[PDB]
Amino acid sequence: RPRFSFSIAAREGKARTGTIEMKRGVIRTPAFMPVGTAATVKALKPETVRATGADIILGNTYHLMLRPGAERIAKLGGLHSFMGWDRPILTDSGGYQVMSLSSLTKQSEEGVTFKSHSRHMLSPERSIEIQHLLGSDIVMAFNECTPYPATPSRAASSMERSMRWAKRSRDAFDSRKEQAENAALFGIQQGSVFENLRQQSADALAEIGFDGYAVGGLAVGEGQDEMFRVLDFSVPMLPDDKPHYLMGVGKPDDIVGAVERGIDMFDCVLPTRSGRNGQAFTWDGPINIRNARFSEDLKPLDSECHCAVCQKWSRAYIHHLIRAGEILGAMLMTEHNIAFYQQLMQKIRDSISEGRFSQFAQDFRARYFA
Amino acid sequence: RPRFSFSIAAREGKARTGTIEMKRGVIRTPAFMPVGTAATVKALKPETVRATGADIILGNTYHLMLRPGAERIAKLGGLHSFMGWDRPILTDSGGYQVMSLSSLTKQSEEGVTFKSHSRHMLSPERSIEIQHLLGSDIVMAFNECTPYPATPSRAASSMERSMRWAKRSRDAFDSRKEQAENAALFGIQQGSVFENLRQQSADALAEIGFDGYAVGGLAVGEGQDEMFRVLDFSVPMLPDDKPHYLMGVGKPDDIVGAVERGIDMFDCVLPTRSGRNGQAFTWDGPINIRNARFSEDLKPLDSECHCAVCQKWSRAYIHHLIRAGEILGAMLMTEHNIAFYQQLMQKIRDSISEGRFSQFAQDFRARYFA
Numbered sequence: 001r002p003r004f005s006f007s008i009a010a011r012e013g014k015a016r017t018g019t020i021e022m023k024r025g026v027i028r029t030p031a032f033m034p035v036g037t038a039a040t041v042k043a044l045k046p047e048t049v050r051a052t053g054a055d056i057i058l059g060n061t062y063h064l065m066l067r068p069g070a071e072r073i074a075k076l077g078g079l080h081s082f083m084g085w086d087r088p089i090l091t092d093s094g095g096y097q098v099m100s101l102s103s104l105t106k107q108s109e110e111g112v113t114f115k116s117h118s119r120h121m122l123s124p125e126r127s128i129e130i131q132h133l134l135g136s137d138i139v140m141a142f143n144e145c146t147p148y149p150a151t152p153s154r155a156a157s158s159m160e161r162s163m164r165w166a167k168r169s170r171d172a173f174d175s176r177k178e179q180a181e182n183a184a185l186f187g188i189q190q191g192s193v194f195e196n197l198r199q200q201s202a203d204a205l206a207e208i209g210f211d212g213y214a215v216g217g218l219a220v221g222e223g224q225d226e227m228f229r230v231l232d233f234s235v236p237m238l239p240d241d242k243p244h245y246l247m248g249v250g251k252p253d254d255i256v257g258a259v260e261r262g263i264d265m266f267d268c269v270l271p272t273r274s275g276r277n278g279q280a281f282t283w284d285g286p287i288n289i290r291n292a293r294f295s296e297d298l299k300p301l302d303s304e305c306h307c308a309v310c311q312k313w314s315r316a317y318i319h320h321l322i323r324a325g326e327i328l329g330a331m332l333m334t335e336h337n338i339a340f341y342q343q344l345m346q347k348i349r350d351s352i353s354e355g356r357f358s359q360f361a362q363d364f365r366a367r368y369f370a
Numbered sequence: 371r372p373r374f375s376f377s378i379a380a381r382e383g384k385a386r387t388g389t390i391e392m393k394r395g396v397i398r399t400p401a402f403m404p405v406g407t408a409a410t411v412k413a414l415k416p417e418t419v420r421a422t423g424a425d426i427i428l429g430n431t432y433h434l435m436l437r438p439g440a441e442r443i444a445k446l447g448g449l450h451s452f453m454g455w456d457r458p459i460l461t462d463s464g465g466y467q468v469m470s471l472s473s474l475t476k477q478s479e480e481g482v483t484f485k486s487h488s489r490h491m492l493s494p495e496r497s498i499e500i501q502h503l504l505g506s507d508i509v510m511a512f513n514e515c516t517p518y519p520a521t522p523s524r525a526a527s528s529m530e531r532s533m534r535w536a537k538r539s540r541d542a543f544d545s546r547k548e549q550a551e552n553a554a555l556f557g558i559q560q561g562s563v564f565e566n567l568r569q570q571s572a573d574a575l576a577e578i579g580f581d582g583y584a585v586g587g588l589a590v591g592e593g594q595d596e597m598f599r600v601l602d603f604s605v606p607m608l609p610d611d612k613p614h615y616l617m618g619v620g621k622p623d624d625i626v627g628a629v630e631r632g633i634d635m636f637d638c639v640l641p642t643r644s645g646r647n648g649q650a651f652t653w654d655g656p657i658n659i660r661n662a663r664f665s666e667d668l669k670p671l672d673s674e675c676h677c678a679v680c681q682k683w684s685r686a687y688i689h690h691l692i693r694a695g696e697i698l699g700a701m702l703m704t705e706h707n708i709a710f711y712q713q714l715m716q717k718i719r720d721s722i723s724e725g726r727f728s729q730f731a732q733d734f735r736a737r738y739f740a
């Protein structure tokens with residue numbers, strides 16, 4: 001019913017669990033968002049995505065503006081209607097994908113001009129408009145993702161431009177009455193691995209004011225140790241009373257450690273992509289289902305998993321499908337992996353609410369990395 | 371409950387509608403069997419195959435004996451358990467696929483030796499044993515599919531060898547108590563396009579005695595006109611009181627015409643394969659969903675179709691998925707096409723039972739080829 005209402009029900013150290021209420025549904029936090037880059041969570045019907053426990057999925061301004069096009073999607077009744085997902089959708093703003101996917105790129109204070117992997121423009125104003133056209137529930141400010149590594153000086157100028165673009169994103173979003181009334185807007189913290197820059201970035205974002213705050217510029221090659229180090233000081237800089245979104249993260253251990261450091265929201269292509277590639281997540285660590293050791297294994301992918309795939313099909317069958325290149329193989333692997341991620345989020349939420357998250361993290365790691 | 375019981379409830383001309391009762395379920399006839407060659411109906415969960423209306427699916431001795439192997443499947447508890455389809459499964463005997471898929475082939479009275487697309491042997495005895503190991507409900511006699519075209523002399527010798535192999539198939543099947551008690555055995559009529567050979571073949575099959583009778587050696591390049599001509603005289607040669615299975619057919623019009631000529635059972639990869647390739651069946655004829663005319667079409671694939679895909683998704687969305695190479699595109703297209711085939715079978719069954727099948731065929735053709 002409300003536009004955006006974040007409520008924290010319980011805490012343990014820096015970890016929080018709670019809910020975000022939005023018009024299209026409730027999002028339980030910490031939350032994992034399956035990635036639906038081309039207006040589909042790959043190899044899954046929306047009803048199946050929902051069955052795994054997902055409360056919200058991620059879309060991409062960059063991909064959708066090229067194909068099938070933002071105005072086209074609006075004309076077809078918006079992204080929710082187009083793809084048949086009626087619950088919240090967060091859309092990334094294009095800033096990251098334009099830098100890692102576009103064949104050619106030209107950056108200025110105005111924004112980015114780029115070549116389609118066809119010439120196109122992105123700016124805070126255009127990014128916000130595209131997300132309006134898509135009908136996103138959570139809109140990301142348009143920004144620049146600083147390349148890693150970066151000098152303090154390069155990170156500084158990059159972060160400052162992002163903060164200028166964040167103000168313009170805010171203004172463009174607020175200018176659109178229907179967007180301001182029905183959607184929410186998140187700012188993106190930058191500043192690379194440098195504490196003083198992260199602080200200035202957080203101060204700039206808080207001064208503008210956002211519904212939520214993402215930690216950007218991580219999961220860009222820095223490694224877990226470095227990422228955790230940056231999170232240690234960066235997350236406490238963000239407003240405590242708003243959701244904290246870590247963009248593009250990540251592996252189960254990354255998620256657990258990030259929650260221990262105050263992160264409430266996550267997205268990664270890992271469960272879907274590695275699913276298609278034969279990697280299945282289990283509580284005993286990942287396994288590669290193509291491996292010959294599984295050819296006659298009648299056990300489910302994981303012994304505890306409650307997902308429909310593990311209720312019905314054996315490792316041996318899925319091993320066969322994946323090795324035969326069968327589509328059903330990708331479907332079952334993906335459903336299980338997304339279900340595994342959601343069960344991980346559930347156990348995280350339950351353990352925080354019950355004040356035993358520290359013990360869960362320890363138990364999880366000891367078994368997962370055995 | 372019974373092993374195999376075919377009951378004809380209604381007739382119109384040569385057309386029949388009825389049921390086959392088997393231990394694993396009832397098969398409504400005329401029936402269409404989705405093809406599950408690699409132990410999966412491509413891009414569909416078994417529950418979805420069942421949701422479209424399928425009563426029975428087809429498996430292949432040839433593919434399964436290579437991958438994952440027949441003894442392996444038996445060890446894993448049989449094909450039904452392996453793939454999660456608990457209803458009847460008909461398995462082809464290998465005879466056709468060994469000739470059109472094997473890189474090299476050596477034929478004798480014993481059987482066929484061949485190279486895996488690894489060296490392997492097939493014979494009536496080995497074929498029956500493989501199908502036993504798979505746990506097929508309807509077992510096909512091992513035969514030779516005569517190449518088209520063929521001289522009368524070549525068709526004759528080929529047909530005669532098939533009839534000898536049919537006797538051996540019968541004997542091998544009957545020798546296996548558990549198979550004889552729980553499964554059924556179909557013979558395959560051969561004789562190419564020649565009436566006298568079709569007759570001798572039918573006489574040979576009837577003298578041996580089978581639970582059902584397939585018309586083999588068609589859908590091999592002869593064209594609909596020729597196929598219908600052969601069916602005109604061939605089907606009445608088969609026992610009237612047993613099911614009549616036309617192997618590898620086919621397009622909707624082929625199915626309707628074949629039912630008009632006394633066929634009760636069908637299988638084809640057309641709905642699944644062409645589904646993945648962008649072809650969707652509609653009552654107004656097939657359409658190619660990739661075509662630009664569909665990019666903003668909000669209508670479902672077909673306006674009358676009752677399938678879940680047409681209840682929820684637009685042509686525009688599916689057009690997008692298929693053009694983006696997205697797996698969900700293949701999933702939705704395949705579900706709709708199999709659902710369309712099953713709805714066609716239902717309308718055929720209803721119209722025969724109501725004595726208005728002639729009118730249905732006429733109405734169907736006038737609209738489908740408009």
Ligand SMILES: CNc1nc2cc3c(=O)[nH]c(N)nc3cc2[nH]1
Nearest residue numbers: 095096145216217218219247248
């Ligand atoms: C997979 N790793 C990953 N790091 C990211 C950083 C950002 C970022 O700083 N900005 C925006 N807009 N998206 C992002 C997406 C990411 N995805």
Ligand SMILES: CNc1nc2cc3c(=O)[nH]c(N)nc3cc2[nH]1
Nearest residue numbers: 465466515586587588589617618
């Ligand atoms: C797609 N066209 C097609 N014609 C067929 C004929 C036979 C046949 O004569 N014998 C056996 N064993 N399978 C068959 C499968 C076919 N599939």
Ligand SMILES: [Zn+2]
Nearest residue numbers: 305307310336
């Ligand atoms: Zn599972």
Ligand SMILES: [Zn+2]
Nearest residue numbers: 675677680706
């Ligand atoms: Zn349909």
